[PDB]
Amino acid sequence: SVNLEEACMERCFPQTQRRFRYALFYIGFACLLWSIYFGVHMKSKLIVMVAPALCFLVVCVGFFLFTFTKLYARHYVWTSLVLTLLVFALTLAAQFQVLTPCLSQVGSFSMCIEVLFLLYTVMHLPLYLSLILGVAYSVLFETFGYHHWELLSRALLHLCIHAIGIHLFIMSQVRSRSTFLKVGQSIMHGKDLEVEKALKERMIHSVMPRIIADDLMKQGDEESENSVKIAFRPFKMQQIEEVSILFADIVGFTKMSANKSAHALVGLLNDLFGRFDRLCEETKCEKISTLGDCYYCVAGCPEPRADHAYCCIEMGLGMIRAIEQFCQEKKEMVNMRVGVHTGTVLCGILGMRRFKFDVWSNDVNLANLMEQLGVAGKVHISEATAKYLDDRYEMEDGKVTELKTYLIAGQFASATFSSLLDVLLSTTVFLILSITCFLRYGAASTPPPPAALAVFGAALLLEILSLVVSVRMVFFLEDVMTCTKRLLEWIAGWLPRHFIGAILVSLPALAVYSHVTSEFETNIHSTMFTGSAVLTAVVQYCNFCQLSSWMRSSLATVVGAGPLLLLLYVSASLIGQEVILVFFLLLLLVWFLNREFEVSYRLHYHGDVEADLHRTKIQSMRDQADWLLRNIIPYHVAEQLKVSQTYSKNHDSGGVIFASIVNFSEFYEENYEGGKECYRVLNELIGDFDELLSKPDYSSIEKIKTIGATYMAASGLNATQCRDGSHPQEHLQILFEFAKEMMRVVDDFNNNMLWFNFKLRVGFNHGPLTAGVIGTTKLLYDIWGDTVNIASRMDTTGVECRIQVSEESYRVLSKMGYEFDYRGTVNVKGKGQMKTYLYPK
Amino acid sequence: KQLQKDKQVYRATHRLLLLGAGESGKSTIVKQMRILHVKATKVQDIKNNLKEAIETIVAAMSNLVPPVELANPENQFRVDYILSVMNVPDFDFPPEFYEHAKALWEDEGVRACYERSNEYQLIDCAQYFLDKIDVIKQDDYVPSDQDLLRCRVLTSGIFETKFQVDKVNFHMFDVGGQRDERRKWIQCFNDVTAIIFVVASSSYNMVIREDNQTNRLQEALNLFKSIWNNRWLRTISVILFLNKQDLLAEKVLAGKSKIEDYFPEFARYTTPEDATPEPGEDPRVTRAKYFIRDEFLRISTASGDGRHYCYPHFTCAVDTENIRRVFNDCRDIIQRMHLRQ
Numbered sequence A: 001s002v003n004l005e006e007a008c009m010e011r012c013f014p015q016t017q018r019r020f021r022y023a024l025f026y027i028g029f030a031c032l033l034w035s036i037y038f039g040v041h042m043k044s045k046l047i048v049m050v051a052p053a054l055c056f057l058v059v060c061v062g063f064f065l066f067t068f069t070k071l072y073a074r075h076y077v078w079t080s081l082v083l084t085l086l087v088f089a090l091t092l093a094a095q096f097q098v099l100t101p102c103l104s105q106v107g108s109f110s111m112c113i114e115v116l117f118l119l120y121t122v123m124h125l126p127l128y129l130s131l132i133l134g135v136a137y138s139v140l141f142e143t144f145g146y147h148h149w150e151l152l153s154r155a156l157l158h159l160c161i162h163a164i165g166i167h168l169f170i171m172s173q174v175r176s177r178s179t180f181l182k183v184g185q186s187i188m189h190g191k192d193l194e195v196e197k198a199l200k201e202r203m204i205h206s207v208m209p210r211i212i213a214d215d216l217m218k219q220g221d222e223e224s225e226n227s228v229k230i231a232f233r234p235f236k237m238q239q240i241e242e243v244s245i246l247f248a249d250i251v252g253f254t255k256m257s258a259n260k261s262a263h264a265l266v267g268l269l270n271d272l273f274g275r276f277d278r279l280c281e282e283t284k285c286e287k288i289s290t291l292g293d294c295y296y297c298v299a300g301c302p303e304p305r306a307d308h309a310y311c312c313i314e315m316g317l318g319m320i321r322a323i324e325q326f327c328q329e330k331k332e333m334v335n336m337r338v339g340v341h342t343g344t345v346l347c348g349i350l351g352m353r354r355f356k357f358d359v360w361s362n363d364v365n366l367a368n369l370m371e372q373l374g375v376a377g378k379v380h381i382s383e384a385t386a387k388y389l390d391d392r393y394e395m396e397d398g399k400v401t402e403l404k405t406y407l408i409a410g411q412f413a414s415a416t417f418s419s420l421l422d423v424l425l426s427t428t429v430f431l432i433l434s435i436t437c438f439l440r441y442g443a444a445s446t447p448p449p450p451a452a453l454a455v456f457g458a459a460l461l462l463e464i465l466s467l468v469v470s471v472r473m474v475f476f477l478e479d480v481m482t483c484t485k486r487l488l489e490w491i492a493g494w495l496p497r498h499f500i501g502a503i504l505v506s507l508p509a510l511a512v513y514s515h516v517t518s519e520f521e522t523n524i525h526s527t528m529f530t531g532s533a534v535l536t537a538v539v540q541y542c543n544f545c546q547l548s549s550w551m552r553s554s555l556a557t558v559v560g561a562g563p564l565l566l567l568l569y570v571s572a573s574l575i576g577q578e579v580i581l582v583f584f585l586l587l588l589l590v591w592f593l594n595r596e597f598e599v600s601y602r603l604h605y606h607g608d609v610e611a612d613l614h615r616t617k618i619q620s621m622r623d624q625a626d627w628l629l630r631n632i633i634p635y636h637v638a639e640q641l642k643v644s645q646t647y648s649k650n651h652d653s654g655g656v657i658f659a660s661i662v663n664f665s666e667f668y669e670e671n672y673e674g675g676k677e678c679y680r681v682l683n684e685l686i687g688d689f690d691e692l693l694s695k696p697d698y699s700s701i702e703k704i705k706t707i708g709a710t711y712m713a714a715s716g717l718n719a720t721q722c723r724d725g726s727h728p729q730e731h732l733q734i735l736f737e738f739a740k741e742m743m744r745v746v747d748d749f750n751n752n753m754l755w756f757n758f759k760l761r762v763g764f765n766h767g768p769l770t771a772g773v774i775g776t777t778k779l780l781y782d783i784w785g786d787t788v789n790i791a792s793r794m795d796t797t798g799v800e801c802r803i804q805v806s807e808e809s810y811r812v813l814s815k816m817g818y819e820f821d822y823r824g825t826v827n828v829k830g831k832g833q834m835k836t837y838l839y840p841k
Numbered sequence B: 001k002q003l004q005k006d007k008q009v010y011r012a013t014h015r016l017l018l019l020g021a022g023e024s025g026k027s028t029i030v031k032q033m034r035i036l037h038v039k040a041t042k043v044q045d046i047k048n049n050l051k052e053a054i055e056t057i058v059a060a061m062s063n064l065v066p067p068v069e070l071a072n073p074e075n076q077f078r079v080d081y082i083l084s085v086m087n088v089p090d091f092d093f094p095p096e097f098y099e100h101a102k103a104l105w106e107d108e109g110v111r112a113c114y115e116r117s118n119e120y121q122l123i124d125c126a127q128y129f130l131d132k133i134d135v136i137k138q139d140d141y142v143p144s145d146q147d148l149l150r151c152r153v154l155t156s157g158i159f160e161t162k163f164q165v166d167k168v169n170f171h172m173f174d175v176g177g178q179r180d181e182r183r184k185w186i187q188c189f190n191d192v193t194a195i196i197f198v199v200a201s202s203s204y205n206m207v208i209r210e211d212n213q214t215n216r217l218q219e220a221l222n223l224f225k226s227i228w229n230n231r232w233l234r235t236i237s238v239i240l241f242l243n244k245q246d247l248l249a250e251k252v253l254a255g256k257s258k259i260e261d262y263f264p265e266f267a268r269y270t271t272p273e274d275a276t277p278e279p280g281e282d283p284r285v286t287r288a289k290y291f292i293r294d295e296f297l298r299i300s301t302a303s304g305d306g307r308h309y310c311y312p313h314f315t316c317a318v319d320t321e322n323i324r325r326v327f328n329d330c331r332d333i334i335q336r337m338h339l340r341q
């Protein structure tokens, strides 16, 4: 945009400032070496040369002072423009006083090459402006060098130096754009990944206690990290002794929830269970869960607590106080009965959808029954509590009305696209160098020497084959046969890339050396011309930035200067001194320049790799926390809860089933290591039921939770839209098919069980129900209603291995062609006698 | 942290679950291992095994369908004394009972009823212990090691035994194998190294105690088919012992019972070419035992998919040397089996 790409040069400023400091130093060093040249070697008869050199050296140290000002940080383009106009004018004015027969073309042209490079690469001017300054400098330098073949040869040399100039320019700034963009990506992903890690933490703590969550956040087992992405499924249980289990049940929940609009009910129930959570976090009792009108805690199951009994009955008396305050405050006639039992408990996680930390033992079943045998307002404790309670409470005899039991009441830029572009430019300057070297023949109409045209054709065909390889690699024609190209693409690794890059860099200097076998040191136009062209070819060795620095720079020194140390002696008198000076300054320039550009390329690859690592890491954390969020609540509640604060809804028709494994108690036996192996078997069965949920034809069936051995699931909730290709009561049909198929799953499970059989009964009912969410910073999706309680009645009054159906669910299921038989007539609390039906015949 | 070392020594052990049907000899193999690689009620339940055997024979006299009667009919008062004490909670074993048991075991209608012991349920240490209680009529004799191996005590519930051979840890799970105990096996199926399936080979002619209408070896075959194809054992190899070789040998050499009377594919069975019998062996016994081995290897062949193997050995659990040899071989085998993970 605009403030994007301005902040780009805000964070690409200091490397531009460092480059500009190096260009200032290099121009000053050029003025220094030409000063000692024209002060010792030649032109010691006139001081017109050396005093502009010394004054421009001190102008450059003036600019090196001016860099440090604070009125530079937005003025750097205009400061660079002033510097490059001074250097343009100085090079033209130090060229201007020649052609008296004293100074060559090979020195002034090196100044031309140097100043065009410092314009293109380091001055950091815009493209149009630096291009028109470059072309204007080149044409003014050729029209002030003049004061039908050689002139157009020099114009060809300026053509290829502007080619390599614009190429280095555009690739340096597309890399400086793209590295900025990748570091912008990698700094967005750090903050956004911190956000997703906070959400994942909040969803872990809402389903597991603190000790085991903080275990899970240092990733103690890596296999869970691999699995959230062979014989038994993994499961975590710890048979822990000496806990103290509390249940609690709201008395009179039905009349308290009598005519609420299913938003008042969730609100008051939120208030009540929030008061209970405050009690839990005071009393240091872990709550476990909340089901229906029932709440239940433990007392130090992950942590060995010494006053666990005390913590449990103190939490029960706290509950009695909190519900009498709620009764006074909100004016609702309720109280609650509490049962407290101690003992040993194996506590962990079973299932894999909707899983949650629970407890299982027989001590838990005892605590459930002593809640069921409790009287309202009073906490109903056992001998197992009271044997170390120390009896500092208002104890009673807890006697039944019908076992030592008591009551208590109180107290661009693609990395293989740049290779295409620089192979293109290397072969086009090899082309026009060959053209310039051929058209030197204005004396012969046909070219004399054989080896020149031989090397010309040889490297010409080599460049055109490497061009076709690269251009069909990118443009991807798939024309003849590519399996040789696929296996030839493989073998150009890092070091074969080095060697083909060596040749593809070198070969224009081979084309210009190809014209040295015929004698040249007789004429001086030929000598200075081949010197100018060979420095034009040595300065062309910048383009393969995907190579290394020292490799290209040392190959440049060799195959651009070594043959002229060879041809130093071939006698040509003081032009050797100025040409070794001129290749010195040019080689120092090209050493620094391709050093800095391959450093830029290395940093671009670094910023690509790190900013892809952070993208995969945030994709992992986002997928993980989204799996936990679709775990703990359904999807449409997550939609209506993202845009708001709490959730409640009243559905007018939805079915629900419970599903109880009847005979698990005669499989439990505790004689081995607590019987946790028996719960591994039960985990396998609940896992097979959860595998039924991943079917695409069981999409709109929700699993509420599992309760001990019982499995609860309900439908009709996600279907907000009355479909055109479907039925208004089809979710009951697919829920009944879900019940049939989990009957099938237990039949398939018993084949792997030897000389024992699990039997389950289910119960089915539909009607209007009441969805809701309880916690905040905890979460719990749950449904309530009368449909649910009649469904639990159809469960518990069931015959095993047979589906039991209520009356209205019979009336709507039997109009879809199913078969049933009249079971009998069952008392239902609230409905009285009720007409039930059974699915197997 | 201290759980990494304990976790890796838990990796280091070998879990040798012993399966097998009723009275196939699992607990005898565990007793043999603790003789190899490691105090008064043993005398009492030796005497219980005695009394159980002698009252079973005395009842089974009249309880054969042709009633084998007394060859010496003077011991009818003794027979009535043995039937008198048949169902009693405790018994102090007076010397009267020792003289009654000895006088019964010398009678030949008694022994003629004993020879038809495939028609009723009788324990597999009667012949040894009638003679040995005739030696230990008294109470001041400590029973020998073979006496400890022969005492039949029923197993109910998962037992364990940790022993260590040459700095390798073995942890094996003796289990009961009656039809009521089989629901308890699946507790032991987590991360078990190997399964040493144990088959009473000589009980081809007997029936199980549960329903009295199913062949013991057919029961063991169906049990092997069940545990081989089990969905939690489909990557776990099964060493297969075949116990009671000597009883099999003498029941074949007695020639009264034929295997083709009960398994009618035996009559057209030929001994295999790779059969490597022991020295001094009637090869019809070899044909018998390789028939039973290949009966199990059919089950281990018809599935498996290269996931888990089966390594049948021949063994007699009341002889310690045989157990030494086959457990050295199995030691190498389960070394290879634990190195499969």
Ligand SMILES: Nc1nc2c(ncn2[C@@H]2O[C@H](COP(=O)(O)OP(=O)(O)OP(O)(O)=S)[C@@H](O)[C@H]2O)c(=O)[nH]1
Binding pocket: B020, B021, B022, B023, B024, B025, B026, B027, B028, B029, B123, B124, B125, B149, B150, B151, B152, B153, B154, B155, B156, B175, B176, B177, B178, B243, B244, B245, B246, B247, B315, B316, B317, B318, B319
């Ligand atoms: N002669 C002989 N008797 C054996 C051999 N193996 C086991 N027995 C006998 O078989 C009887 C039963 O052995 P035992 O170890 O108790 O079987 P078990 O598997 O434990 O019985 P259960 O656990 O299934 S109820 C014992 O009397 C024992 O002496 C054997 O190799 N040779």
Ligand SMILES: [Mg+2]
Binding pocket: B026, B027, B028, B153, B154, B155, B174, B175, B176, B177
């Ligand atoms: Mg046993």
